[PDB]
Paper text:
CysB is a homotetramer of 36 kDa subunits, each comprising a smaller N-terminal DNA binding domain and a C-terminal effector binding domain. To elucidate the subunit arrangement in the tetramer, we determined the crystal structure of intact CysB in complex with N-acetylserine.
There are two protomer types in each tetramer distinguished by the juxtaposition of the DNA binding and the effector binding domains. In each tetramer, two of the chains (B and D) adopt the extended conformation as illustrated for Molecule B in Fig. 1A while the other two chains (A and C) exhibit a compact conformation as shown for Molecule A in Fig. 1B. The change in overall structure arises from alternative conformations of hinge regions flanking the linker helix. To investigate potential larger scale structural changes, we performed a normal mode analysis of the N-acetylserine bound ABCD CysB tetramer in the H3 crystal form using the tools available at WEBnm@.
Residue numbers in the entry:
A (entry chain B), B (entry chain C), C (entry chain A), D (entry chain D): 1 to 324
The structure:
Amino acid sequence: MKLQQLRYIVEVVNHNLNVSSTAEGLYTSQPGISKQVRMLEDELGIQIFARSGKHLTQVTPAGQEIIRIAREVLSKVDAIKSVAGEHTWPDKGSLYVATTHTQARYALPGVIKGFIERYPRVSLHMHQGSPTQIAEAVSKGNADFAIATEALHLYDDLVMLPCYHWNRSIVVTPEHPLATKGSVSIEELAQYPLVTYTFGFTGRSELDTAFNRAGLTPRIVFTATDADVIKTYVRLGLGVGVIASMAVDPVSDPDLVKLDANGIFSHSTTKIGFRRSTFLRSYMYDFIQRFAPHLTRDVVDTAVALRSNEDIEAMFKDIKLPEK
Amino acid sequence: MKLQQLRYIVEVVNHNLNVSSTAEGLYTSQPGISKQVRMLEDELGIQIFARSGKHLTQVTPAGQEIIRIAREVLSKVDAIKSVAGEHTWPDKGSLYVATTHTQARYALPGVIKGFIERYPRVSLHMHQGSPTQIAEAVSKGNADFAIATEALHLYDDLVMLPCYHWNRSIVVTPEHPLATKGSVSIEELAQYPLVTYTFGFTGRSELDTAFNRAGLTPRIVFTATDADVIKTYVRLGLGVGVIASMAVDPVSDPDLVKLDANGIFSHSTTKIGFRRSTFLRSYMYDFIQRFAPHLTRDVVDTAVALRSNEDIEAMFKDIKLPEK
Amino acid sequence: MKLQQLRYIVEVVNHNLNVSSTAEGLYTSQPGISKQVRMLEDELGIQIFARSGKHLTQVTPAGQEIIRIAREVLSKVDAIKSVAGEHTWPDKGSLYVATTHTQARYALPGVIKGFIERYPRVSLHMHQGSPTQIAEAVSKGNADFAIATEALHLYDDLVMLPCYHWNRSIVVTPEHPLATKGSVSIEELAQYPLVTYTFGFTGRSELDTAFNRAGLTPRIVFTATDADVIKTYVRLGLGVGVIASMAVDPVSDPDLVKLDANGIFSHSTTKIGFRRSTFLRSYMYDFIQRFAPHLTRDVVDTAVALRSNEDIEAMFKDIKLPEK
Amino acid sequence: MKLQQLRYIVEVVNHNLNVSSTAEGLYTSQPGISKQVRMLEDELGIQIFARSGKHLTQVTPAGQEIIRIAREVLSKVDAIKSVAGEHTWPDKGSLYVATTHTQARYALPGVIKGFIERYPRVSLHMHQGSPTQIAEAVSKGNADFAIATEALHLYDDLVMLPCYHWNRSIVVTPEHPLATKGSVSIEELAQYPLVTYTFGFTGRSELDTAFNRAGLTPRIVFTATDADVIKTYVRLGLGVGVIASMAVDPVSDPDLVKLDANGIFSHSTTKIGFRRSTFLRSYMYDFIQRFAPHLTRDVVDTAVALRSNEDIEAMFKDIKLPEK
Ligand SMILES: CC(=O)N[C@@H](CO)C(=O)O
Ligand SMILES: CC(=O)N[C@@H](CO)C(=O)O
Ligand SMILES: CC(=O)N[C@@H](CO)C(=O)O
Ligand SMILES: CC(=O)N[C@@H](CO)C(=O)O
């Protein structure tokens, strides 16, 4: 059987079993349609249409099942023609970034807007987590780059490019002693229980440094991996949150009070990192540059070319980067 | 767009994108085929196949939507012929079943006798194979019905009807250590070399779960698709076998000891199913019922009407299926 | 054999067979580690690690049997500290929980508040992550409890306890073609580009299952680990989000519209669990009951003494769990 | 704490609080046991025993629980020592073969047996299937070696080495008409229902070639993949079996009558085969040579270097093959 035979038997039913009438619709003759039908009835071995002399009187019970299915065939044929083009698929390559929740939320939905306009068929996948995790993803090859925020010693064995410098903040509820205060000392901060990052205190961080030169041990009551959680816990108890400054601003967090700790802890440096051996696709260079405007392709090449991260440190040394 | 064109692109895929194989198989010429494909690719304005040179390397994304509808179309045309034959000679046709070696030997002979009694003019064709091979057989047209014994995820696109639950045994020769301990733990078993199915360990079977659970790795010295192969292996060496209980008889197999493993591996479930597109002739319902007494015509038509195989399981929540 | 040696070979697997990483992380010398490890292979007569030069390529098969037991040893040693801690001062200690961003933000504040009130001397620590990352957190010993939301096969080696069932919503901008259709089939959805978790599509998820059932492949333009990041992506573009209903509120998020997907994807079960080796302290039973009311002290110890997580689900058949 | 302390507290209860008996039994001093136990008591910050003067009187409530775990801890340290050596794994490489049931079980039990002993740490994997499935297994890369029995045109583009030559028998129940017929004829056979392989009649097989050149068209009532399954069914009615003669003998199949059919159908050739790019190992060359003694290492290698499949058959022209 052929598609054409199927069209014909569905059209003959559309046009009242008026075989003459059918043919006008479809630019052919009565002994043409009539021939293809009689052929199919012979192939299948059963009559689709009961017949009084020459006139067709009605569709047979077998007839009716067959026409019903033939309508489906036709429906599915048209469906084939309707299939979307290859343009509708994100199959031109994919970018896997490992970073933090703050990196993903704040720095990045102005960059990612910009990147998806430039590359509509390139899929993007943001992994989250601790520094340990962000590092493991790149080196195990389950992510192409890390945007690293701290504990940069774990991204030894990658290539690491400076993006910007960042500073932490003491966030408290509006009710809190600290909320209306000429700044805050390290000793004042060691007084209240701390809500910080899981990896906030490790033994070697900027938080451990500050508490260790002052001889204070801090009381840690709650920790979590992402700032959102920390802020959210800071609607509960005399606890004092320490998080990145760029993870709280007064527009979107008015139940909350950002206070300076730049005196108290040293700055951290966000870097974008990847494996020596990684082919840098066009969209890889575009992402790097959007996120951090000074890392153009010429700049990224100059740095991959150097012997190690020691030298890359010597490259940027006297370059002033943004604070965020 | 011609039906012969949808047969070609489908058959190409059924033959690993090898077009010379496709031709041998369909008794037509390679140029003819490649030609039809290039015309359809042109009519639709959509590359279906990625190409290297002359070679076809893969099915493109848009390409897959096309192939999927094409298979539908083709199975509908088969449905027409099938409907014509029911109305012409109800008791005359052929039944194509894919299932395992064990089902063919231990679940079905009894049923197949009684079926052939009832339907002398219905030719029965039983493909043996792995779960994957069974799924393949229906996917590729060689099989109206599948009796799945496990790895039921491989059939999410079929209607699948529960038949019975079944449990595995440990099988050794009577001179084996484990013969006269007659109370085996997962920890005891994992010492020994294992002789099981090729698809026994797949990452997600019940054997997988039981070892993962106890944190062990199996020692696999030998596998086979077929339980009879496994058993005649076990008659030589120091392997321990893990096969369906119903595959070992105290009568037929008294050189093999059969140990209990209900308290190690969870039971599997056998199901019988078919593409939703498949016209169910009266002899089909018979067969189903003779295999699984609770799968009456009503029950089967009710099941088919539902939308998931999970909803079909909801239908049998208050009924406790046989244990084999 | 020494405890210190077992910590070394296990913390070595933990840092991906990387010995100077193991060193840095445990404030100690690298050869100290190498010499302990060679000593243990010596003492056991078994190579635990494949070697090349002075490089560690993989864990040997008999080597893995040894690590798996080591991990047990150490986690039992930590129990002895915990039994001591309990008997000395019970209301004091720490609790490490690994779960998802969505459970930390939308299921736990109110359980956490209640908990910190009762146990001000118990520091609480919430790891966020993928289902993979949660299993890992308990495996490595950085977590006492897991609160898993899907992919429960990843915790077959844990006592897992059902808490509640949850569902997915399709989320879109209030001007997307889908908002005023109120009526989405999987076919309609599959047209669109998808935004969803990094672990949305894995081959065996509930998302995978709906698509395989309908023969369709999803268009995936962006994934994130974190449901919030998905949410703010969906506030920009053309793509449709697929996330837990409970990550989207009419008042939390009025800029997003939340469409029924109950009839597309099957529900998932949230569960809470922990290594069998873990000693359960008084605040731990407490944490568990505060999260899942039906999970009482008696219930938990009953669930522990069973043998699998299916048998544990068996216990809550004659009881409908909350839906979320 | 140290394993030694845990051994000590454990061992002290075994010797019923007698430190002296302890020292004798573990070959150590009383002062050193007593010191190590105080040490653990300090570390843990709790007493594990009560004291009368200097002797030891009773165990504490916490002690009771610490000892419980201690025993467990020790028992696991034992299990490390008892781990089976690197020899008990079959991890020296594995051998995957795609062939038929017949081949597996009537040619190979004796060829495997010999291959196993020589290579006890080489795992052996026996995929079954139809000719078309056997060829895929290899080309795809789920098996190294196919032992093909017929329709050798599917294994073009693989290296195929002739092994031997085989013919078919008619097979019947002792109650069948042909059971005691002086010979049997292409016409007599055709008048009967036929029971044969699924791929028995293809359009171009030795069964087609025979029935086609006599203008007979056969009735086929049942087909299966395996000969074993073909044999079983032939306890029914009027059906005639057509299978390989090597898969039936009167001693182990006395229920059936093996009646000759060399007049009716020409012989096929069994061949063993692999992909060109396959790196042949030693246990590879061995299995080949145990299966077909003419296929020595040097012959295989000559064959693989040759130009076409053409020449390969010509290499065996003057070499008479076994007949089975
Ligand atoms: C600036 C930044 O993103 N910092 C991390 C913390 O290192 C964060 O997750 O907030
Ligand atoms: C019950 C059954 O047939 N089980 C399969 C294994 O999945 C077999 O072939 O033995
Ligand atoms: C209910 C829940 O927490 N869902 C997970 C996904 O399983 C999430 O991270 O949103
Ligand atoms: C001789 C042989 O093995 N023949 C196959 C069929 O070609 C069989 O399975 O019996």
